[PDB]
mmCIF file of C-alpha atoms in Angstrom:
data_model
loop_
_atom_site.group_PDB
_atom_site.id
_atom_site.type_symbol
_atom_site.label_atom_id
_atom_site.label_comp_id
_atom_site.label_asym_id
_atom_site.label_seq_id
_atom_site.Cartn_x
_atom_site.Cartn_y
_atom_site.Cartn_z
ATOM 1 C CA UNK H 1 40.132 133.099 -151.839
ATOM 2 C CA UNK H 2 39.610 132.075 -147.780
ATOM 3 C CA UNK H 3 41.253 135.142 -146.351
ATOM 4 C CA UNK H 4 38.056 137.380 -144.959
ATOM 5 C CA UNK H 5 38.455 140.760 -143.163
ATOM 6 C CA UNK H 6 35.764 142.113 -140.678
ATOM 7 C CA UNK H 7 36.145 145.591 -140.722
ATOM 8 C CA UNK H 8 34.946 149.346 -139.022
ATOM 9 C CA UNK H 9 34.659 147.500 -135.451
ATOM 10 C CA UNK H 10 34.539 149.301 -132.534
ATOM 11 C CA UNK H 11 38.203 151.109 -131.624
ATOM 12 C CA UNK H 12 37.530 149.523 -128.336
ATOM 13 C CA UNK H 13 36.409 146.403 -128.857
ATOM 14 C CA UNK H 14 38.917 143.369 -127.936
ATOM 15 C CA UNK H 15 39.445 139.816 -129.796
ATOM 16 C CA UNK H 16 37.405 137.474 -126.808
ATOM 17 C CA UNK H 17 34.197 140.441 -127.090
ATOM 18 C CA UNK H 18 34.273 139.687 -131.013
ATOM 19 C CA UNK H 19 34.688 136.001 -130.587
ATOM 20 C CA UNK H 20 31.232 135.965 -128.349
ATOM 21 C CA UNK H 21 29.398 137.839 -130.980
ATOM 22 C CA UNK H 22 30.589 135.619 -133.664
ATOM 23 C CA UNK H 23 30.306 132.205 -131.939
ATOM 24 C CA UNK H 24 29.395 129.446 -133.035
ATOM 25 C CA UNK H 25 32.765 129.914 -134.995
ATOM 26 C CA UNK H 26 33.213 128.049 -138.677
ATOM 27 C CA UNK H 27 36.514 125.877 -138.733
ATOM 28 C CA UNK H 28 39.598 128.345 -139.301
ATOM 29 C CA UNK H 29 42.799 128.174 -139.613
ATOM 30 C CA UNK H 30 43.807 131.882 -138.443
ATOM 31 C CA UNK H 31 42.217 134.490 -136.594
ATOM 32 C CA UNK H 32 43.520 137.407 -135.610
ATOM 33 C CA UNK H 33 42.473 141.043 -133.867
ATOM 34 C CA UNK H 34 44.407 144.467 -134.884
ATOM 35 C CA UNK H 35 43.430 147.547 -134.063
ATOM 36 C CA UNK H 36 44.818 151.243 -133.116
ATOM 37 C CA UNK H 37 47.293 151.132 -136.488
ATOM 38 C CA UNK H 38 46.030 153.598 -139.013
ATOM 39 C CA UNK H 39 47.510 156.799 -140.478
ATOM 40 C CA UNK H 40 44.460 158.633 -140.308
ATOM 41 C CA UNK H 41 43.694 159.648 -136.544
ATOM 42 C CA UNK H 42 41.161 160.219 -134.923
ATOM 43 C CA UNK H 43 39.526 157.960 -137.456
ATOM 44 C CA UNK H 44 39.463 154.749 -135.079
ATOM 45 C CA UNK H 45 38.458 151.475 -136.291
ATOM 46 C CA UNK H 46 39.303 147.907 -135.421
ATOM 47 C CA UNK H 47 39.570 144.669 -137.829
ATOM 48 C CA UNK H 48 39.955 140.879 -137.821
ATOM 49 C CA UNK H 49 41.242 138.471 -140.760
ATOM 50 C CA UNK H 50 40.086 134.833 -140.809
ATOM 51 C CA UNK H 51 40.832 132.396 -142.579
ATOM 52 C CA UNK H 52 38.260 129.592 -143.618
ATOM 53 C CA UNK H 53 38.349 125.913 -144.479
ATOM 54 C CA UNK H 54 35.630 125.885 -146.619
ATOM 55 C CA UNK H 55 33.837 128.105 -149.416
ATOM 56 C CA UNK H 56 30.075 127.739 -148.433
ATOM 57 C CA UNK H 57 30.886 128.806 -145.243
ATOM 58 C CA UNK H 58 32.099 131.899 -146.227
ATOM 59 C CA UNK H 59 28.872 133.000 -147.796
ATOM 60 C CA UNK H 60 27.066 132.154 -144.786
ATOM 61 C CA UNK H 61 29.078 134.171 -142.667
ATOM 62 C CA UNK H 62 29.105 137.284 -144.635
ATOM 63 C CA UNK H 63 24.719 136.776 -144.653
ATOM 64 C CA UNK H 64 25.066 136.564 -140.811
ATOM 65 C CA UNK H 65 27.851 139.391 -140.136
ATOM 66 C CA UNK H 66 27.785 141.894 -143.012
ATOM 67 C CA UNK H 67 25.833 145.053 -141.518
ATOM 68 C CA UNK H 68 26.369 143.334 -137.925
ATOM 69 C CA UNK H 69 25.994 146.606 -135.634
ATOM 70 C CA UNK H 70 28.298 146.481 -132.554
ATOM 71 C CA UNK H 71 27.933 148.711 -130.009
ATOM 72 C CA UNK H 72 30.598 150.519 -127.652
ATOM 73 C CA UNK H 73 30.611 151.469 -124.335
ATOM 74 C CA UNK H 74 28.850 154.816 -125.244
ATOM 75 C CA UNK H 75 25.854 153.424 -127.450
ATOM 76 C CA UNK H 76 27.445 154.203 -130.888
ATOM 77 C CA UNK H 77 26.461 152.095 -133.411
ATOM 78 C CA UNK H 78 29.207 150.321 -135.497
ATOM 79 C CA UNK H 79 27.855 148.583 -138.698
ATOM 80 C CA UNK H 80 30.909 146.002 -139.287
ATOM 81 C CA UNK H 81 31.636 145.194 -142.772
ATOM 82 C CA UNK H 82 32.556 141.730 -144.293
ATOM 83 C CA UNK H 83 34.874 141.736 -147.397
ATOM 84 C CA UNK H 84 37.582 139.006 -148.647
ATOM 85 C CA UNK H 85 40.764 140.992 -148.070
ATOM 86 C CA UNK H 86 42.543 143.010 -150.457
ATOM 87 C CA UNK H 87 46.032 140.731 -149.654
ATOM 88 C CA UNK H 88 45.106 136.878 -149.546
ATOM 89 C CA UNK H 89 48.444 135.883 -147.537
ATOM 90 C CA UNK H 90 48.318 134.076 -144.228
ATOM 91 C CA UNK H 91 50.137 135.028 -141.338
ATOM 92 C CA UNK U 1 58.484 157.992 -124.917
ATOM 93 C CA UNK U 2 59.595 154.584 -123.762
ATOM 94 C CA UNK U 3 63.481 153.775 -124.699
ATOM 95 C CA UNK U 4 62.402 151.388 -127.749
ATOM 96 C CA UNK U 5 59.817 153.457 -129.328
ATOM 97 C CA UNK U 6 62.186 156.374 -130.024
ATOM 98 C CA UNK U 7 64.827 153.488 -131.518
ATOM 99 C CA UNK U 8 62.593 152.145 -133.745
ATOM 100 C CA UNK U 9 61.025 155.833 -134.759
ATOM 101 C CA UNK U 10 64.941 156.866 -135.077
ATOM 102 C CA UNK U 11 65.661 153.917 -137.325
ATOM 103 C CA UNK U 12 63.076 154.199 -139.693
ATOM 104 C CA UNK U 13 62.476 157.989 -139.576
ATOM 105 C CA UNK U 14 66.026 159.478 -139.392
ATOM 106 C CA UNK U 15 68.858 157.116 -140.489
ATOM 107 C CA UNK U 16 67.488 154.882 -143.172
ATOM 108 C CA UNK U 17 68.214 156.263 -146.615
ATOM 109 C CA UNK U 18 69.145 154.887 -149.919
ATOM 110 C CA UNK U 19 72.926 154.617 -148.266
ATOM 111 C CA UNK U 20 72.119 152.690 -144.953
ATOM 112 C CA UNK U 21 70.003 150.275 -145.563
ATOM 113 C CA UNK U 22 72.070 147.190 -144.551
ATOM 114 C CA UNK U 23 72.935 148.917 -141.451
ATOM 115 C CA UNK U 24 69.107 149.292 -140.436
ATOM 116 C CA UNK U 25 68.565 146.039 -141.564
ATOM 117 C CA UNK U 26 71.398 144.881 -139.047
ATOM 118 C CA UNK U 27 69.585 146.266 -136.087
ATOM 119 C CA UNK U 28 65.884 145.467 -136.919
ATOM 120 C CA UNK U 29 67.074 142.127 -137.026
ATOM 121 C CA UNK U 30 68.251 141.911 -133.594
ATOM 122 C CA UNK U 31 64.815 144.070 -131.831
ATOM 123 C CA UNK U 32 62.702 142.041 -129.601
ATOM 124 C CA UNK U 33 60.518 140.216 -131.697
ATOM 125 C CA UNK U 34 59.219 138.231 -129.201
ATOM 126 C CA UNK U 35 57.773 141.308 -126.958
ATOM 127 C CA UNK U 36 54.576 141.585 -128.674
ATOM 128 C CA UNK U 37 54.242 145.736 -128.014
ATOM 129 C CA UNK U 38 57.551 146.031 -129.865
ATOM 130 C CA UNK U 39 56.325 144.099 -132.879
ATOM 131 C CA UNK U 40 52.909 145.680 -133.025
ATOM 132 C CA UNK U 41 54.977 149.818 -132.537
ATOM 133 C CA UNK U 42 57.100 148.975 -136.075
ATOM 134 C CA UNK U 43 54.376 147.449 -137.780
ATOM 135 C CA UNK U 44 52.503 150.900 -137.049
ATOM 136 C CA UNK U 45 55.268 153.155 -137.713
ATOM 137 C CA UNK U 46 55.432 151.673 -141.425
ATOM 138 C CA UNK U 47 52.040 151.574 -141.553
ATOM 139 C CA UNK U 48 52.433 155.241 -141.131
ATOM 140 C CA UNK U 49 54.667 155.831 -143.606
ATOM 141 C CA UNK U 50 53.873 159.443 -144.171
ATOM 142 C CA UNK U 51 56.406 160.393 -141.583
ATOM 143 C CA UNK U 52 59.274 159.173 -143.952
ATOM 144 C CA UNK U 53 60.799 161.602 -147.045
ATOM 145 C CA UNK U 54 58.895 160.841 -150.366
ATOM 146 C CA UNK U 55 62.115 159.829 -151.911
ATOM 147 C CA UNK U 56 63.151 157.459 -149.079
ATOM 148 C CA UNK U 57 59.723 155.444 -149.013
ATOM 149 C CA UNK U 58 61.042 153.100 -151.120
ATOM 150 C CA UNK U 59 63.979 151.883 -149.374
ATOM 151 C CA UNK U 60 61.475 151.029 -146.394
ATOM 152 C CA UNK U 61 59.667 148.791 -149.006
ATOM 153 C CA UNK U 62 63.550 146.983 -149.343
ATOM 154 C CA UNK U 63 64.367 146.940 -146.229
ATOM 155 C CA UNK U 64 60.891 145.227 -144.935
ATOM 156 C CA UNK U 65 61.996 142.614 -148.504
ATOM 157 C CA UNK U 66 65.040 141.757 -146.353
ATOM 158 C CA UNK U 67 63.450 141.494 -142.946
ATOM 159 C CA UNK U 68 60.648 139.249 -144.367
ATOM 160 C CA UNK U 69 63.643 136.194 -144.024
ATOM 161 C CA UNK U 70 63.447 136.475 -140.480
ATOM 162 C CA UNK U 71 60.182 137.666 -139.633
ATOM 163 C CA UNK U 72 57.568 137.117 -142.822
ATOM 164 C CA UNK U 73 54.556 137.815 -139.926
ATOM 165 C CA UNK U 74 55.792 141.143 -139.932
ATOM 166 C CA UNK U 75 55.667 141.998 -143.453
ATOM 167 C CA UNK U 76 52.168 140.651 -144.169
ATOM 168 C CA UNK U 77 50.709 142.622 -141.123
ATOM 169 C CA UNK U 78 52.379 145.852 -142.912
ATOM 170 C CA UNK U 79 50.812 144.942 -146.644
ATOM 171 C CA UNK U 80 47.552 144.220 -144.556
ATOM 172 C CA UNK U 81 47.309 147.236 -142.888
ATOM 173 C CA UNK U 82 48.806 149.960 -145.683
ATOM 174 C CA UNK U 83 45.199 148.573 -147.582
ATOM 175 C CA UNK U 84 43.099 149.250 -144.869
ATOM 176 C CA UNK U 85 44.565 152.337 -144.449
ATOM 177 C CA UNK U 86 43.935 153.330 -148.405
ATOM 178 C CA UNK U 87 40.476 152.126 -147.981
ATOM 179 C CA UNK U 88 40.261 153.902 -144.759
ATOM 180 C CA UNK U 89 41.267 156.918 -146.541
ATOM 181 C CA UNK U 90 38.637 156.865 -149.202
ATOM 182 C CA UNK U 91 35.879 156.473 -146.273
ATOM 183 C CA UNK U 92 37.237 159.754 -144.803
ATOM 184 C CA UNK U 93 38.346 161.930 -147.442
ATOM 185 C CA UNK U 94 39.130 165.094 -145.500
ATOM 186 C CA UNK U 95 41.872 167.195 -147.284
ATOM 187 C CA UNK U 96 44.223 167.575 -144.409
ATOM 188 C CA UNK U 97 44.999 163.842 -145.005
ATOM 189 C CA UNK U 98 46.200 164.310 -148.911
ATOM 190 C CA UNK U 99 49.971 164.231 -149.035
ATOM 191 C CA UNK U 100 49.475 160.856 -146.509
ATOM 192 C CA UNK U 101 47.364 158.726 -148.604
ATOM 193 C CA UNK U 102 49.297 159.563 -150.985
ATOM 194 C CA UNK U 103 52.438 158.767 -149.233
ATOM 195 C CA UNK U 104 50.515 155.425 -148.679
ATOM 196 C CA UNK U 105 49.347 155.067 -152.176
ATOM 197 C CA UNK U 106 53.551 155.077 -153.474
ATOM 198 C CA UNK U 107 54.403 152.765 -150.824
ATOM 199 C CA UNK U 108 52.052 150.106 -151.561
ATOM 200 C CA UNK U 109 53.735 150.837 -155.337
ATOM 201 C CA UNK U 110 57.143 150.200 -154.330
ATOM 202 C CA UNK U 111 55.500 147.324 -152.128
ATOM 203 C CA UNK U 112 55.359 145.724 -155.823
ATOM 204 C CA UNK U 113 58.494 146.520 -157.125
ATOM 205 C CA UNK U 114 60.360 144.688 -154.047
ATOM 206 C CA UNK U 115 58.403 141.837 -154.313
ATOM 207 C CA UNK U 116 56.142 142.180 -151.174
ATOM 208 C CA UNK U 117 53.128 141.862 -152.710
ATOM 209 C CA UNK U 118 51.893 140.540 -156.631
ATOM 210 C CA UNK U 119 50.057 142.281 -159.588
ATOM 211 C CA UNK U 120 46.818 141.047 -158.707
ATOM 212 C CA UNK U 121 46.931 143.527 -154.996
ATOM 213 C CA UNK U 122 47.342 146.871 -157.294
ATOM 214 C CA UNK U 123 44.974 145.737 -159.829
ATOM 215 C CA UNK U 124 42.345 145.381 -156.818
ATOM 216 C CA UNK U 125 43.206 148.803 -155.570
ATOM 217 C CA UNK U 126 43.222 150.381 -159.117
ATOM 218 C CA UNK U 127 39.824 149.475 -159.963
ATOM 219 C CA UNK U 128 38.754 150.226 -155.998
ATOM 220 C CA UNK U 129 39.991 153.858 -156.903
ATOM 221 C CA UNK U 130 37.710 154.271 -159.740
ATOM 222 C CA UNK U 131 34.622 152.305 -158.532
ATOM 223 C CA UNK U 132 35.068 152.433 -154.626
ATOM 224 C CA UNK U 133 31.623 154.363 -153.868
ATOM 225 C CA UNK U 134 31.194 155.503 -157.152
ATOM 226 C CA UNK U 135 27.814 155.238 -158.545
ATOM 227 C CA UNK U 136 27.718 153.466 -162.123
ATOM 228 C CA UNK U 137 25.679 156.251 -163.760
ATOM 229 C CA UNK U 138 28.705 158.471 -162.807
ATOM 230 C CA UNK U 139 26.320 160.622 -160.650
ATOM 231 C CA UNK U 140 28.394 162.227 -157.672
ATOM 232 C CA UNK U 141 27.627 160.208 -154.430
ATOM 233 C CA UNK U 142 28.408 160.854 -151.073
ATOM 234 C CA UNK U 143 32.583 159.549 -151.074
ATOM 235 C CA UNK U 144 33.094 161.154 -154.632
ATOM 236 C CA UNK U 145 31.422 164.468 -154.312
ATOM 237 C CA UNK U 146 31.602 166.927 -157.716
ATOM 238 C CA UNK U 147 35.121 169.023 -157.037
ATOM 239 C CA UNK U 148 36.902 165.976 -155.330
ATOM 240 C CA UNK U 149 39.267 164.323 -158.152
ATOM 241 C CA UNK U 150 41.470 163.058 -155.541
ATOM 242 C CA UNK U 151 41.058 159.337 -156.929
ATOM 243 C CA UNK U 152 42.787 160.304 -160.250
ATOM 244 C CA UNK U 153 45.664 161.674 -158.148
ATOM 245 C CA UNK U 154 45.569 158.090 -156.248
ATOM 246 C CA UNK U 155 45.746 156.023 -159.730
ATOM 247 C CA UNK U 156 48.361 158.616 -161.258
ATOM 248 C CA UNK U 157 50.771 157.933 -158.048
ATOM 249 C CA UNK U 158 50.372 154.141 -158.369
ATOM 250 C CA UNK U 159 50.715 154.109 -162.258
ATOM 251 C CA UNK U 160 53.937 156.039 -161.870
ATOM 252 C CA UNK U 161 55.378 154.299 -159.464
ATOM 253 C CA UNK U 162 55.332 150.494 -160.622
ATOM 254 C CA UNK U 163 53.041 151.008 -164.126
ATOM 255 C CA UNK U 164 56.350 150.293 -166.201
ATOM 256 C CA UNK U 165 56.312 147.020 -165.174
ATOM 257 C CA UNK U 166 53.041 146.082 -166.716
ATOM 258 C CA UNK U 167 54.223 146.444 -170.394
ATOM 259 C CA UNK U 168 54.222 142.770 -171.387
ATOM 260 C CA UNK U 169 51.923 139.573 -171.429
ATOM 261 C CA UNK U 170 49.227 139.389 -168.972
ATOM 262 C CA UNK U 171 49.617 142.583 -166.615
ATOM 263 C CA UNK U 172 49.954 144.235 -170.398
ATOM 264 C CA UNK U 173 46.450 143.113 -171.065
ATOM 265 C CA UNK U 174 45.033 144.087 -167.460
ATOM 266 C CA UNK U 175 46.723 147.078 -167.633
ATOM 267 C CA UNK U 176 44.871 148.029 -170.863
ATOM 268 C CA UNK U 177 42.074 146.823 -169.249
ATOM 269 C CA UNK U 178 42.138 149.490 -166.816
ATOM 270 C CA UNK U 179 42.903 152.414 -168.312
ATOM 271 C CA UNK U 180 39.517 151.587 -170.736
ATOM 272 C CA UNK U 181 37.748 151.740 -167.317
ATOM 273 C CA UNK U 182 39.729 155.148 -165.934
ATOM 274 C CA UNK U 183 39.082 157.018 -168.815
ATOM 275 C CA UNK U 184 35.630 156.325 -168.453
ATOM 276 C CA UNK U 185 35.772 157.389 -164.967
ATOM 277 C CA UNK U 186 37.737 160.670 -166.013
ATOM 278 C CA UNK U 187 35.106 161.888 -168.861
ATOM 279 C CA UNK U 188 31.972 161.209 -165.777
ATOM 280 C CA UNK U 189 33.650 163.772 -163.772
ATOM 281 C CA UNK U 190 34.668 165.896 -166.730
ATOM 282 C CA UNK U 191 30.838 165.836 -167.383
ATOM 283 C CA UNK U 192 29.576 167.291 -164.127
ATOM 284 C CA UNK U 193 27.199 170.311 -164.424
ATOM 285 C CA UNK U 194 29.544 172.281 -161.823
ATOM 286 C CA UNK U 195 32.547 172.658 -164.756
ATOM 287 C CA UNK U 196 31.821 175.281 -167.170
ATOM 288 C CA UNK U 197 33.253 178.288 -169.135
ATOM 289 C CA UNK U 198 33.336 180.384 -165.810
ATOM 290 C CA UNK U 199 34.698 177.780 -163.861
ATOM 291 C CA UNK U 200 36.454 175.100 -165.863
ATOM 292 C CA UNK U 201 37.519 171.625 -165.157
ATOM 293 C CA UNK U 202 41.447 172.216 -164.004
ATOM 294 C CA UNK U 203 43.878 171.852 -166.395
ATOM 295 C CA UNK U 204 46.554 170.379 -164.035
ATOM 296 C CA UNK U 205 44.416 167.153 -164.031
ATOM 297 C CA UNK U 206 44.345 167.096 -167.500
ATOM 298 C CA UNK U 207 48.175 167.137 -168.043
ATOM 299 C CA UNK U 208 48.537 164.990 -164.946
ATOM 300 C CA UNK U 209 46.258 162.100 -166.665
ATOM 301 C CA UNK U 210 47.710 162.510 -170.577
ATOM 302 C CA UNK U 211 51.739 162.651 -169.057
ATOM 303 C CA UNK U 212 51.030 159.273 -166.812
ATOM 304 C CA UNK U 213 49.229 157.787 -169.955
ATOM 305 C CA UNK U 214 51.329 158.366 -172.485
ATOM 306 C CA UNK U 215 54.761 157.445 -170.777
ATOM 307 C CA UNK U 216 53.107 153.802 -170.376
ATOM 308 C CA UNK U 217 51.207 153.801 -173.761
ATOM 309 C CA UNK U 218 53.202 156.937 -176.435
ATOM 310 C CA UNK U 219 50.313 155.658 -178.885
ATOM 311 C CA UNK U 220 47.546 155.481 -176.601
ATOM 312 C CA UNK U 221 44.102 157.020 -177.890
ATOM 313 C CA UNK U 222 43.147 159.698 -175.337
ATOM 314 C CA UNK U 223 39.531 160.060 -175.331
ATOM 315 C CA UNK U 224 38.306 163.208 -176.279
ATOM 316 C CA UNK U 225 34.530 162.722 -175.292
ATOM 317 C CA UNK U 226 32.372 160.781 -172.771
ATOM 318 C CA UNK U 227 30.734 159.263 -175.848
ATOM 319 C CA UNK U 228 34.087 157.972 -177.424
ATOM 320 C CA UNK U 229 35.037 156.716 -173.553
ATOM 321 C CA UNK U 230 31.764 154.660 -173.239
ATOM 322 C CA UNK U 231 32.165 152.979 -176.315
ATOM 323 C CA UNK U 232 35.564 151.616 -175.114
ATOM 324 C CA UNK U 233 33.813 149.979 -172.440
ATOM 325 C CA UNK U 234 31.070 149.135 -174.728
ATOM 326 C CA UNK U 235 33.537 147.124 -176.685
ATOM 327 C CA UNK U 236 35.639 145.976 -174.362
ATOM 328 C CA UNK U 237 31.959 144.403 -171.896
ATOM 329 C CA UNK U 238 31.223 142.899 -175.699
ATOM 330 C CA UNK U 239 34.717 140.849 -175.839
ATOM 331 C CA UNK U 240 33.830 139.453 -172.136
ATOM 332 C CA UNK U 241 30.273 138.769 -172.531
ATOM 333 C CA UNK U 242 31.743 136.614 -175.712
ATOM 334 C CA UNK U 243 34.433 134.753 -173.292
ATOM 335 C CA UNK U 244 31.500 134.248 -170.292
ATOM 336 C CA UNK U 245 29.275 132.593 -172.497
ATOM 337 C CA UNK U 246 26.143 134.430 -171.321
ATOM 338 C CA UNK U 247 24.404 134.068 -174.647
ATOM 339 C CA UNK U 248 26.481 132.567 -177.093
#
């Protein structure tokens, strides 16, 4: 298992925003933002997938990220969640 | 609506059935792949596949099997975002979204039985159904309140839809696995102190559960108590702790 999701982000927040907030980055092979895609509106949430090269970094970033509040422009909080992802294929 | 958005809605929504598939296929070959709004507006509209006839879902699950050949980015980002969308679901949990999970519950079925994704994806979401903010006690929480049974509606739709297939060798085993754990999960909210002679546990549930067990396993013991259903587990968490080694 390498393929992590990052999950319940702010609807508003963009790829570069997320990629400040995680930096520094672990070696990756993918990573990718989606957002703006669900069935179940207004219930608006935003999500990345990574992929990692290693295993013990993938506990490390779940310590650092997991429960990671983001804020967006209105002062809502947004506890993100770290999971593996449900389907392990890479895009 | 911009020109493309109401072809691809028209494509998917309207004309594909059962009898046109290799026509649709035809012409989502040939879309725009390369504009990046077009790719991201069809991998949404099957995302929300609520908006297509029960009966039909399944031939968007074949014709996304024959589009993978061209463009496999397309079909992962669907699989990816139909699970999100389930889990999304059971975060949520409002009534007025019922007939789409469960739109989105039989398409991630018939995501099996074309070959999008394996065994071990509905496994993960047939065990998220009964434990996904579920306390172990079996005390109602705040995603699986007392009256809501909606996640033994969830496992029924998937079990129907591709639970045939899981009749021999290892997805047999898993399979059985399972259903010791469901029943379980059935007989906790059975148990609750809001069901009694005034206000029984409903009955449609009941035949729901025994009609989707019983076409996958006719001699299937249907537990008849919590008691009986916790021994099940009992013996089944006694075979693993023997193959984990965590005393013997």
């Amino acid at each position: 298992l390498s393929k992590v999701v990052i999950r319940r982000l702010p609807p508003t927040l963009t790829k570069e925003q997320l990629q400040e907030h995680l930096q520094p980055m672990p070696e990756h092979d993918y990573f990718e933002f989606f957002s703006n895609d669900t069935s179940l509106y207004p219930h608006m949430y935003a999500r990345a997938y990574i992929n990692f090269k290693n295993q013990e970094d993938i506990i490390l970033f779940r310590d650092r990220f997991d429960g990671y509040v983001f804020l967006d422009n209105k002062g809502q909080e947004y506890p993100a969640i770290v999971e593996f992802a449900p389907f392990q294929k890479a895009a | 609506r911009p020109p493309l958005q109401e072809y691809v809605r028209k494509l998917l929504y309207k004309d594909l059935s059962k009898v046109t598939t290799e026509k649709v296929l035809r012409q989502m070959r040939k879309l725009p792949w390369q504009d990046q709004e077009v790719k991201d507006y069809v991998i949404c509209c099957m995302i929300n596949i609520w908006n297509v006839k029960y009966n039909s879902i399944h031939c968007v699950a074949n014709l996304l099997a024959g589009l993978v050949l061209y463009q496999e980015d397309v079909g992962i980002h669907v699989v990816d975002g139909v699970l999100e969308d389930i889990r999304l679901g059971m975060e949520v949990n409002q009534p007025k979204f019922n007939q789409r999970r469960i739109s989105s519950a039989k398409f991630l079925g018939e995501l099996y039985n074309y070959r999008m994704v394996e065994s071990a994806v509905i496994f993960r979401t047939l065990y998220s159904f009964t434990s996904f903010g579920v306390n172990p006690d079996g005390s109602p929480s705040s995603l699986d309140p007392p009256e809501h049974l909606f996640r033994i509606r969830l496992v029924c739709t998937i079990l129907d839809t591709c639970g045939q297939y899981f009749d021999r060798g290892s997805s047999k085993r898993k399979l059985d696995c399972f259903l010791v754990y469901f029943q379980r999960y059935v007989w906790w909210k059975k148990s609750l102190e809001v069901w009694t002679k005034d206000h029984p546990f409903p009955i449609d549930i009941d035949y729901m559960i025994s009609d989707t067990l019983e076409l996958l396993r006719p001699k299937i013991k249907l537990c008849n108590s919590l008691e009986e259903s916790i021994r099940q587990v009992q013996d089944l968490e006694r075979e693993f702790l023997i193959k984990l080694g965590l005393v013997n």
